[PDB]
Structure 1
């Protein structure tokens, strides 16, 4: 009725997962289905606690739009990818009506909008490039990315696969994309380590996360190119089922938070960086 199944995914600082048996402080309860073993379908819901920028947005929406929720962490993939014409990840949970909405660092793009509705964006994102300070690269259009074997040694650059960034590169730059896959990074933390130790020259990824990591990088050695330039500007959105009756109220509430100054508080709390 008024009690909604909501899916999220850990990605600091937008969603941060901690252990608990009562969640305290600025945290909200969230469950994670953990398998017993790999020869079974049996699992157990572990009770954990969630906080972060997108959790504070969900709290505000819950209070303002007036709903309650049971928050859970996706276990079938990550943000969302269509595999053999079937959506997985947070998008999949919404498409297949296991969640009423998805809340987190979820990028709005065209193909996802064909299967879910999105709220208005509320965090600016897109595709940025993170490098060591001083690296001479113009952008995604740089020939070092577009025609990497024109250079000896070639530029080493990768992304974390299966999200909105890899989808966009695969669609727009086929040669770059097929070159890139050998530099696939399992996650953001691995990629930052590769950058700092000189095993990677560039890390192409979600603009808002790179902006966050650049702002908190030790010694401010790692930067986004073009003073934080973003290709294919978009935003994080709340994903809802197609035709959701909650979309209009969520949109108006987000726009109210913006207009009344409430979003600045969340940005200052979660998104500021020393660099």
Structure 2
């Protein structure tokens, strides 16, 4: 049957095309993950339908109810067959779903407004004049909440106690906060998003310092799914063919607006 793909709108991975109202089906969407879903399906020989996760989440388990939300939840509970999105490969997700080998590398990174006198996480951690935070859901927040590393633990303590709230709900909100805060907000976000934004007008942000960790995004399937093996081999094939690098250049750099 048609494979149900769950994904989520996030630039430049999945976006509704400007003229989407005139299109149908999968053709309504564009972006890195859209292109990737099409290549994976072509290599594994299946038809598929892109659907957008209802709750707008990636995947976390409620501590009380023990229910998985997000795209991971759609897989775990049988609502979707595959998740193709900037879904960070984490231990807690790997315990309940199957992940491909990573299709893209990333790490938590610092986005500043140009001119901000910050060069590293340790720099942020030692001060408060420049506020800093993360998405209020997702693997970045969890990284900090869970870290036993001294600098990241101090940052997490800072972020929980800082007022007003340093958390944002969306990547767009975080970028807007950076751009509007006159150098007094720094956003901690995945390096991929950071790099994407740095290439976009008004060219007033930049990624600074090293990344805080290293990890990858993977394609996820329900545990035991017969699709898993084929999609993993497809990811490795596409990587080896240079197609993943091509897609990254297409969506991040090829039409870069900032020099």
Whether the TM-score (by the shorter chain) exceeds 0.5 is yes
2:220 aligned residue (239, 254, 259): 239
2:37 aligned residue (53, 58, 64): 58
Partner of 2:160: 178
Give the 5 Å matches for 1:57-96: 57-83=36-62, 84=64, 85-96=66-77
User: Does residue 156 of structure 1 match 2:135?
Assistant: no
Partner of 2:21: 20
Q: Displacement, 1:87?
A: 1.2
Q: Structure 2 unaligned runs (5+)?
A: 148-152
TM-score, normalisation: structure 1:
0.81
Contact 1:9 1:73 in 2 (8 A): yes
Contact 2:57 2:70 in 1 (8 A): yes
TM-score, normalisation: structure 2:
0.86
Q: Displacement, 1:57?
A: 0.6
Which structure: greater strand fraction?
1
Task: For residue 5 of structure 2, give the secondary structure of its aligned residue in structure 1.
Answer: strand
Q: Displacement, 1:21?
A: 5.5
Partner of 1:224: 207
Listed one character per residue, the Cα deviations across residues 85-111 of structure 1 (whole Å, up to 9, x for unaligned) are: 221011111111111111111111111
User: Does residue 249 of structure 1 match 2:248?
Assistant: no
Distance 1:191 1:97 in 2: 33
Q: Structure 1 unaligned runs (5+)?
A: 30-48
Distance 2:122 2:88 in 1: 22
How many pairs were matched up?
243
Task: For residue 162 of structure 1, give the secondary structure of its aligned residue in structure 2.
Answer: coil
Following TM superposition, where does structure 1 have runs of at least 4 consecutive aligned residues deviating by more than 6 angstroms?
none
